[PDB]
Amino acid sequence: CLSGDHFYAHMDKIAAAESIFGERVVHGYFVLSAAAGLFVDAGVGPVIANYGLESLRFIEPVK
Amino acid sequence: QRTAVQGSPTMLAAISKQWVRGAKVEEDRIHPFRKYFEELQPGDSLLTPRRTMTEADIVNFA
Amino acid sequence: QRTAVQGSPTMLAAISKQWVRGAKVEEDRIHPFRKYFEELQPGDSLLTPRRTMTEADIVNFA
Numbered sequence: 001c002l003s004g005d006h007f008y009a010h011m012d013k014i015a016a017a018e019s020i021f022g023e024r025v026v027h028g029y030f031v032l033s034a035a036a037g038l039f040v041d042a043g044v045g046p047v048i049a050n051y052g053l054e055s056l057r058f059i060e061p062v063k
Numbered sequence: 064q065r066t067a068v069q070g071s072p073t074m075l076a077a078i079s080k081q082w083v084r085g086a087k088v089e090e091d092r093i094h095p096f097r098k099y100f101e102e103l104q105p106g107d108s109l110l111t112p113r114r115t116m117t118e119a120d121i122v123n124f125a
Numbered sequence: 126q127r128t129a130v131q132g133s134p135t136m137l138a139a140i141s142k143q144w145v146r147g148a149k150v151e152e153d154r155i156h157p158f159r160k161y162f163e164e165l166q167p168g169d170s171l172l173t174p175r176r177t178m179t180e181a182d183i184v185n186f187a
């Protein structure tokens with residue numbers, strides 16, 4: 001909903017059964033966003049900016 | 064017989080046994096969804112509370 | 126042989142059989158995610174609709 005990414009492997013139950021994944025899988029960008037939800041300090045510190053991302057690969061699907 | 068009945072909407076409501084657009088209302092301190100079918104009268108009204116439309120409402124609904 | 130090919134990016138794109146950074150685009154009225162592998166050309170572009178970032182977007186994503 002929030003991102004706007006309504007891809008069939010995430011929002012369809014029928015086509016996700018016909019896909020390579022077998023059922024509906026979590027968005028890769030939500031794994032990437034919830035990760036930064038897990039490791040980022042909320043407080044003011046030495047960390048300033050995000051500056052980019054080096055090399056991302058999604059290996060196994062998250063259900 | 065097809066008859067064009069002219070008059071005020073609060074009169075056309077009583078003639079037609081319905082509610083029209085500008086007829087008088089029967090606001091009676093309890094909710095019209097609490098009433099059964101036999102105690103609903105055509106004209107049983109409800110002035111709801113308000114809700115301010117914001118940009119966050121547009122974003123969350125979109 | 127390592128050759129440093131110069132020229133315009135729309136020329137380097139056709140030399141390298143890729144799309145590089147400032148090359149011309151092939152916008153062809155249907156979405157490139159509908160095309161199969163053999164009909165995707167390097168250069169098949171897409172100009173998406175916009176989206177206004179608001180404070181509610183930051184709140185909902187945080």
Ligand SMILES: CCCCCCCC(=O)SCCNC(=O)CCNC(=O)[C@H](O)C(C)(C)COP(=O)(O)OP(=O)(O)OC[C@H]1O[C@@H](n2cnc3c(N)ncnc32)[C@H](O)[C@@H]1OP(=O)(O)O
Nearest residue numbers: 005007009010020025026027028029057058059060061062
């Ligand atoms: C949003 C923009 C895209 C629009 C479409 C959106 C589609 C989605 O949202 S899907 C969202 C969830 N994402 C996923 O589930 C991704 C699924 N994971 C995969 O990539 C699957 O393995 C699959 C089957 C699709 C392809 O993988 P497959 O080629 O069969 O085998 P695999 O072992 O993974 O090797 C491929 C890549 O994985 C990487 N990899 C695999 N194992 C490892 C490992 N242990 N360490 C590091 N990298 C690894 C490799 O680097 C390789 O990349 P490269 O091109 O550099 O060689």
